[PDB]
Amino acid sequence: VLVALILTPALCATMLKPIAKGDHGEGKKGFFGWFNRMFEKSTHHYTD
Amino acid sequence: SVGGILRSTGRYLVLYLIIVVGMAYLFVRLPSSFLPDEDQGVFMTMVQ
Amino acid sequence: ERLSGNQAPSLYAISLIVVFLCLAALYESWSIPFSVMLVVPLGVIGAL
Amino acid sequence: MPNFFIDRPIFAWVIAIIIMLAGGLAILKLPVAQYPTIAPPAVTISASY
Numbered sequence: 001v002l003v004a005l006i007l008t009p010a011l012c013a014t015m016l017k018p019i020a021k022g023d024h025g026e027g028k029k030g031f032f033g034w035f036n037r038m039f040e041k042s043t044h045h046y047t048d
Numbered sequence: 049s050v051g052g053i054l055r056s057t058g059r060y061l062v063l064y065l066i067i068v069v070g071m072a073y074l075f076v077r078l079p080s081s082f083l084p085d086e087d088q089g090v091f092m093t094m095v096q
Numbered sequence: 097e098r099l100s101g102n103q104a105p106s107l108y109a110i111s112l113i114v115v116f117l118c119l120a121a122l123y124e125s126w127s128i129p130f131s132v133m134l135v136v137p138l139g140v141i142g143a144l
Numbered sequence: 145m146p147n148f149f150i151d152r153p154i155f156a157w158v159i160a161i162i163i164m165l166a167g168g169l170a171i172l173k174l175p176v177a178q179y180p181t182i183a184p185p186a187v188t189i190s191a192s193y
């Protein structure tokens with residue numbers, strides 16, 4: 001929790017790459033592209 | 049005098065290393081003990 | 097003498113590392129601390 | 145505290161490095177075994193006639 005309150009936020013501000021609005025990694029081509037489309041679809045099933 | 053040293057710089061970078069090497073020499077040169085012998089106002093004489 | 101003796105050099109190395117880190121946190125820079133760290137040999141030379 | 149270390153990322157790293165360093169030095173000194181003292185202690189009185 002101390003790492004999550006001190007270090008993790010500091011890194012998230014400095015390291016993480018900017019993500020565009022609406023981008024959920026569905027546009028990716030390969031395994032990750034398939035998994036992101038699969039997971040986003042599984043969330044709709046779950047929420048419903 | 050401080051203002052003049054800032055203009056030079058290069059000379060005092062070399063003078064620093066001489067002090068660091070001089071320090072390194074004196075360190076190894078100086079013998080090592082644990083605790084000095086103190087005058088306790090008393091001593092003993094062995095007879096064998 | 098034989099087992100457990102010369103253990104000072106390592107604790108001095110830890111001290112200089114932990115001092116550098118604490119200085120880096122104070123000034124919020126990896127470079128600035130060295131301005132303070134380079135004064136240590138100017139003091140040690142006198143003691144020697 | 146989170147907002148403090150977002151502006152001070154080096155401070156955040158310094159806290160992490162010091163913890164990791166302290167841990168590294170502990171590993172050297174720490175003893176090793178299968179279990180700790182889990183067995184209850186016993187005292188034996190031995191006599192001979």
Ligand SMILES: CCCCCCCC
Binds near residue numbers: 045046
């Ligand atoms: C991630 C698991 C979702 C499963 C939903 C099942 C509803 C028929």
Ligand SMILES: CCCCCCCC
Binds near residue numbers: 126
């Ligand atoms: C002790 C770790 C120092 C790392 C310096 C990084 C400079 C960008």
Ligand SMILES: CCCCCCCC
Binds near residue numbers: 157161
């Ligand atoms: C900004 C980079 C920090 C370096 C961390 C070093 C960990 C031993």
